[PDB]
Write a protein that binds this ligand. Structure first.
Ligand SMILES: [Zn+2]
Ligand SMILES: [Zn+2]
Lengths: 182, 182
């Protein structure tokens, strides 16, 4: 696990913040997910994590893809959104190579939240995907959408259990890599 | 600053979360402040920080005061609240003896955000106080309330710039303790 490289990035930016629900912005939620998961992987496990920093995300695709290629797992955090404010659940978009990783991530979040796993236990393939960062998924990264920002109830749960959810994600990544806590 | 000790805690708990504004809760914002500032002081400045953990707060007073007494500076993060939803500004409650630290913190946040300083450049004394954790300030800790959760505009600013606000706080603490800015 100490030879492994985990890439974590955040979708969207301060100027183009993705989906919004009130004063909650996708860009901000994605920044929190990337930062918290990164910090736990580094602190609790001493693992190598490469990121697009601690600020907002939306690293240029060219640069992102270079990071994807240099890593063992690469995850960009996003929130889902629908006009239907009852739409709910967890999904991760990637190539079939990454199905197991998508399922590990999705299950980690489902256990903590009771949210529904969409797709195949949280996996949706790139060949059928529609996304602003579909190119990231096509390149072998994972576009992870743990919840719909448009779902007020799920968003409230996320906001009240953010650190616990992100710890579940970090712990699941470490477990899959066989990394013990340090 | 390498031999100094900082204490950081958070107000309120998961099931008694303090003031709320929609699905934003004081306990959760306080947890973010405490965790982000602590992580910057530890990871960027290499300083020694004592905390009530990475979860929710409301460490018992007997325990909290042990940390206050064993630190060079001790801050519990809270949010202010009012019936008047346009009430605004920064305050830090502590003993008179501890005025300078309160003003350092408040002015740092004012510079970053443009928020108004309440009291004397952010300081308010423990001897005229009304607060659930007044006893934390009475012991010479600092009950820090950088903004009113009840103010939609200021809460939104916190939400969109929190990592910068928390870095401004961490920088102010480090520099006052003798460390070079990072
Ligand atoms: Zn997105
Ligand atoms: Zn409070």
């Amino acid at each position: 696990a100490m030879s492994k490289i985990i890439c974590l990035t955040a979708g969207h930016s301060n100027t183009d913040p993705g989906a919004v629900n009130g004063s909650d912005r996708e860009a901000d939620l994605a920044q929190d997910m990337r930062n918290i998961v990164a910090s736990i992987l580094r602190n609790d496990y001493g693992l190598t994590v490469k990121t697009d920093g601690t600020g907002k995300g939306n690293m240029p695709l060219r640069d992102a893809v270079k990071l994807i290629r240099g890593s063992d797992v690469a995850i960009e955090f996003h929130t889902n959104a629908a006009a239907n404010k009852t739409a709910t659940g967890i999904e991760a978009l990637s190539t079939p190579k990454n199905k197991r990783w998508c399922q590990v991530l999705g299950k980690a979040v489902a256990k903590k939240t009771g949210w529904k796993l969409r797709g195949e236990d949280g996996f949706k393939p790139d060949n059928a995907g529609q996304h602003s960062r579909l190119a990231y998924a096509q390149a072998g990264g994972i576009v992870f959408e743990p919840f719909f920002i448009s779902n007020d109830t799920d968003l409230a749960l996320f906001k009240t259990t953010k650190w616990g959810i992100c710890r579940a994600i970090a712990d699941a990544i470490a477990m899959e890599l066989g990394a013990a806590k340090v």
